[PDB]
Design an enzyme around this catalytic site. Structure first.
Site, short mmCIF file in Angstrom:
data_model
loop_
_atom_site.label_atom_id
_atom_site.label_comp_id
_atom_site.label_asym_id
_atom_site.label_seq_id
_atom_site.Cartn_x
_atom_site.Cartn_y
_atom_site.Cartn_z
CE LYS A 1 2.98 -3.86 3.87
NZ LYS A 1 1.64 -4.53 3.90
CG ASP B 1 2.45 -0.40 5.86
OD1 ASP B 1 2.58 0.41 6.80
OD2 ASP B 1 1.87 -1.50 5.99
#
Ligand SMILES: [Ca+2]
Length: 314
Positions: A238, A257
């Site tokens: 991420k 996410d």
DNA sequence: GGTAGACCTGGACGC
DNA sequence: GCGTCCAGTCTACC
């Protein structure tokens, strides 16, 4: 009068203009904490922050992007200085063109996007972006903004003061790498991320070839870049994407996410197929990212920004 | 290789 | 008003 944050109304002789329609850029949708966490609407429709190592205040009209610099005799920004602004907002990238394509291939984008035109991505500094987002993990935007601010107050170069605000530039690797910094960050509230910031600074500087290393990733491939980034502590897929997407000119990077799963699921009825588990997992998050890259194309990441802006406003 | 849990903080719920 | 829940990485492990 000549004190405090400026305004387009108050000190007219001090602003320059950059041709730019609100359709191609919406300061109220781009500067709020999310991509960067350093801008502040000190005055309605007026955003101030550090850009290209100087403080500016930006506000816009329906077809003009008004800018103002605080550097020593005060004067409207120079042409070159204004360029720094265009480079930061990547103005040469035409949002109408991108929105059209995305619309063409995705009816839902087509729908949603209408109300939220002008969402683009800022071309950020690797260092700042790396550390800002190291602070973003398993956290929320409110704290993050706070953490990043304290961090810059305590370790960043002092710039100029406006009203009761003393601007700071983002800290350097050396600074962040300094001794006892972790204990310091811990006192600022970054929690366990304190060590990550401390370690990644030292790691970059003492194990990867320093600042130059990151600056080399701008030239590498997303695949390579994302790969390399993951070494650093507190930097996973991420955060690695955030960096690639917002500072390493990799517009196809798609930061996945829990936020994104919500969108993928309720707006596309998306399900992991070639993966194993049914919920979030390294393999499944990898898939979600691929899904949108093939759906939107080369600038998938930019597209994600649009859905995020439209989403949060609901 | 591909799961589980743990984790600094602090504004949100929910009981 | 308290306790649980939210808002990514990392590591112990079958
Ligand atoms: Ca969560």
């Amino acid at each position: 009068g000549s004190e405090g944050h400026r305004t387009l109304a108050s000190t007219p002789a001090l602003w320059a203009s950059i041709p730019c329609p609100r359709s191609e850029l919406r300061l109220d949708l781009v500067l709020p904490s999310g991509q960067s966490f350093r801008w502040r609407e000190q005055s309605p429709a007026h955003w101030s922050g550090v850009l290209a190592d100087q403080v500016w205040t930006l506000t816009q009209t329906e077809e003009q992007l008004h800018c103002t610099v605080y550097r020593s005799q005060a004067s409207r920004p120079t042409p070159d200085e204004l360029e720094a602004v265009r480079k930061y907002f990547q103005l040469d990238v035409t949002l109408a063109q991108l929105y059209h394509h995305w619309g063409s291939v995705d009816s839902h984008f087509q729908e949603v996007a209408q109300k939220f035109q002008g969402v683009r991505l800022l071309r950020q500094d690797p260092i700042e972006c790396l550390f800002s987002f190291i602070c973003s993990s398993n956290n929320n935007i409110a704290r993050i903004t706070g953490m990043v601010e304290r961090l810059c107050q305590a370790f960043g170069p002092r710039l100029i003061q406006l009203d009761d605000v003393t601007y700071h530039g983002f800290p350097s690797l050396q600074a962040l790498a300094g001794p006892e910094v972790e204990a310091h960050l811990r006192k600022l509230g970054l929690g366990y991320r304190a060590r990550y910031v401390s370690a990644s600074a030292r790691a970059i500087l003492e194990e990867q070839g320093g600042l130059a290393w990151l600056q080399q990733l701008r030239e590498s491939s997303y695949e390579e870049a994302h790969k390399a980034l993951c070494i650093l502590p507190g930097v996973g897929t991420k955060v690695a994407d955030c960096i690639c997407l917002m500072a390493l000119d990799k517009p196809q990077a798609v930061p996945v996410d829990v936020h994104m799963w919500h969108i993928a699921q309720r707006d596309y009825s998306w399900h992991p197929t070639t993966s194993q588990a049914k919920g979030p997992s390294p393999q499944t998050n990898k898939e979600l990212g691929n899904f949108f890259r093939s759906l939107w194309g080369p600038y998938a990441g930019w597209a994600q920004a649009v859905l995020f802006s439209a989403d949060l406003r609901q």
